[PDB]
Design an enzyme around this catalytic site. Sequence first.
Site, PDB file in Angstrom:
ATOM      1  N   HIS A  13      85.766  -6.905-149.346  1.00  0.00           N
ATOM      2  CA  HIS A  13      84.517  -6.910-150.167  1.00  0.00           C
ATOM      3  C   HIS A  13      84.413  -8.038-151.193  1.00  0.00           C
ATOM      4  O   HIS A  13      83.318  -8.407-151.634  1.00  0.00           O
ATOM      5  CB  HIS A  13      84.331  -5.544-150.870  1.00  0.00           C
ATOM      6  CG  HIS A  13      82.868  -5.122-151.064  1.00  0.00           C
ATOM      7  ND1 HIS A  13      82.458  -3.830-150.956  1.00  0.00           N
ATOM      8  CD2 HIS A  13      81.714  -5.874-151.352  1.00  0.00           C
ATOM      9  CE1 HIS A  13      81.123  -3.758-151.168  1.00  0.00           C
ATOM     10  NE2 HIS A  13      80.668  -5.012-151.413  1.00  0.00           N
ATOM     11  N   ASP A  32      71.661 -10.430-131.854  1.00  0.00           N
ATOM     12  CA  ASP A  32      71.521 -10.714-130.409  1.00  0.00           C
ATOM     13  C   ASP A  32      72.317 -11.966-130.051  1.00  0.00           C
ATOM     14  O   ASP A  32      71.992 -13.097-130.468  1.00  0.00           O
ATOM     15  CB  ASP A  32      70.044 -10.843-129.964  1.00  0.00           C
ATOM     16  CG  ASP A  32      69.892 -11.230-128.472  1.00  0.00           C
ATOM     17  OD1 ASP A  32      70.916 -11.370-127.768  1.00  0.00           O
ATOM     18  OD2 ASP A  32      68.742 -11.396-127.995  1.00  0.00           O
TER      19      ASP A  32
END
Lengths: 419, 419
Positions: A153, A366
Amino acid sequence: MKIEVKESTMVRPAQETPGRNLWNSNVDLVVPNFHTPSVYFYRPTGSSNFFDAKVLKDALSRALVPFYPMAGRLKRDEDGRIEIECNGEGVLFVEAESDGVVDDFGDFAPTLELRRLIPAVDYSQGISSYALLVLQVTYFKCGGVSLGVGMRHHAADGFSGLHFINSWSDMARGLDVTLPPFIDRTLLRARDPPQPQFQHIEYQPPPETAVSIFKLTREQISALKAKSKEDGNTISYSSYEMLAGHVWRCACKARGLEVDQGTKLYIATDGRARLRPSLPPGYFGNVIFTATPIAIAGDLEFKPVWYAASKIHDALARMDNDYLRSALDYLELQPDLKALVRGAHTFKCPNLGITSWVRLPIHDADFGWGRPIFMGPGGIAYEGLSFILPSPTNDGSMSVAISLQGEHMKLFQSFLYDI
Amino acid sequence: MKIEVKESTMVRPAQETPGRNLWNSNVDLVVPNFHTPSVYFYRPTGSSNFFDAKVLKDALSRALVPFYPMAGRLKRDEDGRIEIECNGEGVLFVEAESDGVVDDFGDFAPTLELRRLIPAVDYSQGISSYALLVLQVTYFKCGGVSLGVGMRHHAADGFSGLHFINSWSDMARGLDVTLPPFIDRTLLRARDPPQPQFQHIEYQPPPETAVSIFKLTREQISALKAKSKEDGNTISYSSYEMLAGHVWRCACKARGLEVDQGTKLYIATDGRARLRPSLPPGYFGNVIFTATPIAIAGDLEFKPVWYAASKIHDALARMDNDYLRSALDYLELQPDLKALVRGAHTFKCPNLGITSWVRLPIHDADFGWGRPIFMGPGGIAYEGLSFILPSPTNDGSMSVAISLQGEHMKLFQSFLYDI
């Protein structure tokens, strides 16, 4: 079904990248070790090179050029403060295979089962040992594929990590990065001298588990929003306020708290638009602040959903530029930032936490073989934590992924769908 | 010692006053039947006519000319709404005498004992039967005098009732009213149409007793204010915030609530200066709104006093013109205003209520024989209610009058003086 590792590679940037010790802001430091890991699922398309590992590794490599610090390692400055050493060491890419299939995962609820699709890290060798990003591609018996993602993080928030995955996917399709990252966290320097204006409860530490995902259609969200009329309330709240209120209240009601008991809800909030002036687009870092509305469980239950919603509303509207500047300054004056990280204590009953992925581009990855049929948290590390996900198909529905005590999960579901 | 009634008079205005049906605003209607009754104590001066009843009755009479509606009676309009019929019927003035003395009352703690210095009303004969104001002068064996005061709350708040007592006292000294009352509550009409901007929890009903007064010197208040430095807090709160915080926290700690339990503090607040534009000076009516900060008892106890103080601070700063206009509008839309009155439920453990008389001219009533040596609540009707009083001598000290369960009173005191 067991998951076997076929291949492992430390993917370095495609060419040499510049060096730099990347300063971490206070909201870069008040984060847990690792982000909630994420998981994507895609369906086979028939194509022979479906998610060709080579095509991906090369694409990763090229993406790690504009996003160089992602290939870096955590180190400490003279003062013991954590910074990212931009040394180009790279990101871990793992190729795995399963004898089971994608439907084996059903509703894709973030159980322990899903952790097995993200690699496990040895975060017990010092802070410079391990990668900031680990990625796993798992190949399935019915032709299906899961991408699994773990990001330490300190590197960035979900908004910025997703900026990176997405850009990686663009590159696989032979495109360049549509919006290059801006890299400079000093835009979140505390003021000098630091002069806080509020108390910041969000940052002051307190002194058998089930996991499920429940879909709610466009029509249930809509019915639920309409409950804002109850008892002549004239104030409209948003779909998010009402649904997050509804979730809080269902949790209280199902946990079976007493009338006079206190409940804090912890809400994650993107500072990107609230700050003045606003950050540059593609800002690469962490910018999550926390709103904590507080209530008596009696009020939440025995009043209409809109009450709970109204508390979430007020808490969020307070998160303006003044509040956020004040929270940077508050953190500047604290002696130990890791002391302030929200652990497994923070969310246990009777408290709760809710994160919304609704505005996140969780479905834009994608790689040349289509958008995922699902993207979600790949495991929930604590009881009392819940996520809200937009529809993988833009059909107005939303899911609630949540972990509770298994006892409370049956009533929880009952109350969620009481609309 | 028993208290005997010597004489009773319905004191009418000195000359004929005009008629009028005086409209009540929404904050005139959301009040209990009667104000907290008040009591003054004066010391003999040697003078032969010390508090001469006749001098007082005549003075009362003359005061009830500019303040005519005080001599009125409650009635209802076509719609069942309560208004004051200005019919000049007058105010009850009672002359009593005691075989005991003023020191018999000790610290002047608002026990049941003090109710006996204010007359008892037959509020069980319909709303037009009884006076808005009852006054009792009690003559003591050692030459001392108590004035006792009961005001039905629909007539006015403490600020306005005290405007009246004080003006009465000026008139006794042969002065006229220094600041004539402005009489028109329509300045607090809700907007048309009524459009509330907040939820107003203050107005949404929840769905062996000891009383004491504790003096804190100028130096203890001052030490207490200085605790705002603890753990590097950089924000200063006022003496009131810190002392009211301290009272809340002492009550929680002494009541012995669990870590995870909720506590609401109810705070009375004068709208006179917060409204824009502000009311005319001498506005005669009710203008008290309510701030309700909310907390987990764990936080209040286990954090420094400044945390509790900070909650009181935020809640109060929110009470701006927008919030108050919104609260008028909120009330306009409610079907039944008497349903919203805070009863004996409101303040029971683990909740609390605190009223501050610090800015009230509670000591200015000089009838020609000096200022009172004490003025205070003459009785506390509920557990969980507390008052804060300025010093009868302007020496920086303050007292806390409070009613609790007798069990909690010993620890309460212990914790109050831990500074």
